Amino acid sequence: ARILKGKEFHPNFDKISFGEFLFECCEKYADRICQIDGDLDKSETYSSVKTRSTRVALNLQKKGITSTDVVCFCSTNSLDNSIPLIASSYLGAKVVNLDPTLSVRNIQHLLSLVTPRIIFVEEESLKLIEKSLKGAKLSCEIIVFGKSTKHGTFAEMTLPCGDEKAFKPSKTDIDDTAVMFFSSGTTGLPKAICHSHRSFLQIVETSFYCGYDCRSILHFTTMYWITGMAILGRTFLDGSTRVFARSMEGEKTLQMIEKYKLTSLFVAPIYTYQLTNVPNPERYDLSSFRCLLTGGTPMSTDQYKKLTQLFPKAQVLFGYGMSEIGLLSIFHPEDDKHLIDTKVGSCGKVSPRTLLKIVNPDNEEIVGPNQKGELRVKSDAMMTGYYRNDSAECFDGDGFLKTGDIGYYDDDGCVYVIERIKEMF
Ligand SMILES: [Cl-]
Numbered sequence: 058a059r060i061l062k063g064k065e066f067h068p069n070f071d072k073i074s075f076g077e078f079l080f081e082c083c084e085k086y087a088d089r090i091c092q093i094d095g096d097l098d099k100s101e102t103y104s105s106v107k108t109r110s111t112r113v114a115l116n117l118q119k120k121g122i123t124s125t126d127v128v129c130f131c132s133t134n135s136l137d138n139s140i141p142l143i144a145s146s147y148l149g150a151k152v153v154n155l156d157p158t159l160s161v162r163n164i165q166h167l168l169s170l171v172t173p174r175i176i177f178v179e180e181e182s183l184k185l186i187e188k189s190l191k192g193a194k195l196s197c198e199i200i201v202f203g204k205s206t207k208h209g210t211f212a213e214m215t216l217p218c219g220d221e222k223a224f225k226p227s228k229t230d231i232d233d234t235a236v237m238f239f240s241s242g243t244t245g246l247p248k249a250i251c252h253s254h255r256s257f258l259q260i261v262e263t264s265f266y267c268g269y270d271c272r273s274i275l276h277f278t279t280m281y282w283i284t285g286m287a288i289l290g291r292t293f294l295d296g297s298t299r300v301f302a303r304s305m306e307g308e309k310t311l312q313m314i315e316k317y318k319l320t321s322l323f324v325a326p327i328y329t330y331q332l333t334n335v336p337n338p339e340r341y342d343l344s345s346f347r348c349l350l351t352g353g354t355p356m357s358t359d360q361y362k363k364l365t366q367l368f369p370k371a372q373v374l375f376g377y378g379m380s381e382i383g384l385l386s387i388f389h390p391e392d393d394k395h396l397i398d399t400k401v402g403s404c405g406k407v408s409p410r411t412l413l414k415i416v417n418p419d420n421e422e423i424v425g426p427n428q429k430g431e432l433r434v435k436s437d438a439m440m441t442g443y444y445r446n447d448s449a450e451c452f453d454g455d456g457f458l459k460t461g462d463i464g465y466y467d468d469d470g471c472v473y474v475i476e477r478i479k480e481m482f
Pocket residue numbers: 170248249250443444445446
């Protein structure tokens with residue numbers, strides 16, 4: 058019986074705000090490509106992103122936004138959707154994303170949790186947001202990504218004014234909340250998961266030391282999901298390029314890998330079947346591709362194998378994580394290269410600077426390998442708590458996060474998740 062412990066690293070982003078992080082990354086990697094819209098074939102540099110976000114921030118400041126405010130976003134991925142998020146982060150404000158595919162009743166509840174001062178919304182989700190605010194009986198400024206007479210527009214927020222040259226992100230308390238997500242326990246309604254500047258930056262930094270290639274990474278998930286936000290943070294960290302597309306299609310994804318020379322892609326297992334059913338894949342030059350990132354539901358060994366055949370120069374990395382703490386287990390590309398072709402279907406090994414234990418609930422004691430129990434985890438990437446609710450029971454007597462998952466580990470420390478505990482809040 059032991060506690061699995063990931064490899065050490067020296068944190069470099071543990072003394073600053075998330076806004077200062079993003080700002081510094083922009084300066085460092087100014088001439089590199091920050092983001093590419095795979096659908097429209099448009100791109101933008103870190104330099105340009107810095108300019109537009111600085112202008113949005115200065116305007117947000119004039120509207121009275123400070124670090125205590127929550128700024129909300131409801132939009133699919135575009136070249137604009139992250140700009141006001143970055144801008145809001147410069148001011149130390151709390152940022153949170155809503156899923157445009159959620160019902161009015163679900164959005165209403167989410168808004169009631171975080172009661173935002175401003176919400177940026179895509180044109181397609183404007184009625185949804187208007188209806189939800191009306192239902193929740195909440196007042197909130199709406200700013201549209203597009204045209205509006207009734208509400209303000211994103212284009213207005215990018216209007217240059219003020220001392221752009223002198224602007225610096227606000228000094229703030231790095232243990233204050235920087236980013237929020239929403240819980241999904243097996244019972245009870247969602248709650249607002251709070252990450253501090255420190256905790257979120259450790260989600261990002263821990264993912265970097267997992268060692269996987271992100272130089273040019275494609276994804277489809279919106280910023281509602283931890284993966285969306287974590288990928289953005291991770292690409293900023295070393296001046297890599299984030300690529301997005303609205304919908305996953307097999308053919309178009311292979312075309313994008315060829316067209317942009319992608320090194321990586323994140324997507325849930327079930328969509329990978331669209332890749333493996335593309336006929337005559339050899340007609341695409343996929344030689345740039347190094348890493349298919351996946352997880353969240355189980356992947357069959359045959360599909361796993363088919364994927365390695367489709368991408369012969371790549372590794373397939375199936376990981377495990379959650380909104381409350383980021384990435385928890387995954388195989389290191391080089392250090393675990395041998396096991397990546399052997400030990401399917403595990404979730405990999407524990408991530409750097411992370412502790413993972415399996416606990417027998419009755420008796421409440423940690424167990425050895427090949428003994429199933431409740432997965433519990435602990436690291437500096439852990440959420441600080443809920444925004445207005447009580448996360449006390451999410452953590453055990455030793456301060457470990459209860460994942461709500463049942464699993465076990467190997468003699469070689471490979472992790473296996475098998476099921477969720479029923480009716481856990
Ligand atoms: Cl809450």
